[PDB]
Design a protein around this ligand. Structure first.
Ligand SMILES: NC(=O)c1ccc[n+]([C@@H]2O[C@H](COP(=O)([O-])OP(=O)(O)OC[C@H]3O[C@@H](n4cnc5c(N)ncnc54)[C@H](O)[C@@H]3O)[C@@H](O)[C@H]2O)c1
Length: 267
């Protein structure tokens, strides 16, 4: 298998539609041995982890908790065994309070809310790398999830600002990881109907926010030369696994687009 013998930590499972659930599933089917992390609802997440192809341990990680981060490497080592190291780390973590995602105008998001979203969505990519690089093997790989923020998307407002910060953080993490023999890259996915996003397109932040995301989704499918399936994150999961493998060993600090090609076309 593509990831035979690799030990990979995967953050970000909260539902069975989470991108991270599919990353974990595909990675296990490709031979990887996993450690999962979960935020807050650990019993809920454990029952989802129980549905993965193979048994894998779940440990707690709130990326806003300094003690969780400062103990993370030790707690991972407790699961994989002293002397064993990680080959891969997946950041699949995002959050922005509703005030920053269209329930009110762009200008009405208070900084306390924006700062919380940037903490979880962007700064924590550096936090996670800081915590785990000391227990990573040369040849290893850190991968984070991106949503192309090169143009303003009124569908996502301050989450797009957070992704712009994340892309910058990724390039600096590549610099830190390099001397360890470790790569850092982002996978920019098209829109996926995770439970949170299905709620927004469904109307939970109001009619206008629902229509804005729906228009974004519709344009995406029109632009993508190979199509885009918002109800199936498997192609995104495979792309993450490609970057976790040994097959892109000279790629670091970059963004790989798993978006059906929609970012490359203008209609
Ligand atoms: N859904 C999409 O359309 C889409 C598209 C491109 C990229 N992405 C990105 O993919 C990543 C995964 O999101 P998703 O779409 O699978 O949604 P999701 O809601 O299933 O996953 C987001 C995860 O972030 C976790 N999280 C939030 N606060 C946290 C904290 N304090 N500590 C640790 N974890 C925390 C949640 O518990 C959840 O597991 C995010 O970075 C998201 O921005 C999503």
């Amino acid at each position: 298998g593509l990831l035979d013998g690799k030990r990979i930590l995967v953050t970000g499972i909260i539902t069975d539609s989470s991108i991270a659930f599919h990353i974990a599933k595909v990675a296990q089917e490709a031979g990887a041995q996993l450690v999962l992390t979960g935020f807050d609802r650990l019993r809920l997440i454990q029952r989802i982890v129980d549905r993965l192809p193979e048994k894998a341990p779940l440990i707690e990680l709130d990326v806003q908790n300094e003690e969780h981060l400062n103990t993370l490497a030790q707690r991972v080592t407790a699961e994989i065994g002293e002397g064993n190291k990680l080959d891969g780390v997946v950041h699949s973590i995002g959050f922005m309070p509703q005030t920053g995602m269209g329930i009110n105008p762009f200008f009405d998001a208070p900084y306390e809310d924006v700062s919380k979203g940037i903490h979880i969505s962007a700064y924590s990519y550096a936090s996670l790398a800081k915590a785990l690089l000391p227990i990573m093997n040369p040849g290893g790989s850190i991968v984070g999830m991106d949503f192309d923020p090169s143009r303003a998307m009124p569908a996502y407002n301050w989450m797009t600002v957070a992704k712009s910060a994340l892309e910058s953080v990724n390039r600096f993490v590549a610099r830190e990881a390099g001397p360890h023999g470790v790569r850092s890259n982002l996978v920019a996915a098209g829109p996926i109907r995770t439970l949170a996003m299905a709620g927004i397109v469904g109307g939970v932040l109001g009619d206008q926010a629902a229509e804005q995301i729906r228009l974004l989704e519709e344009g995406w499918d029109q632009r993508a030369p190979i199509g885009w399936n918002m109800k199936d994150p498997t192609p995104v999961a495979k792309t993450v696994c490609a970057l976790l493998s040994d097959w892109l060993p000279a790629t670091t600090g970059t963004i790989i687009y798993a978006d059906g090609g929609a970012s490359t076309q203008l209609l």
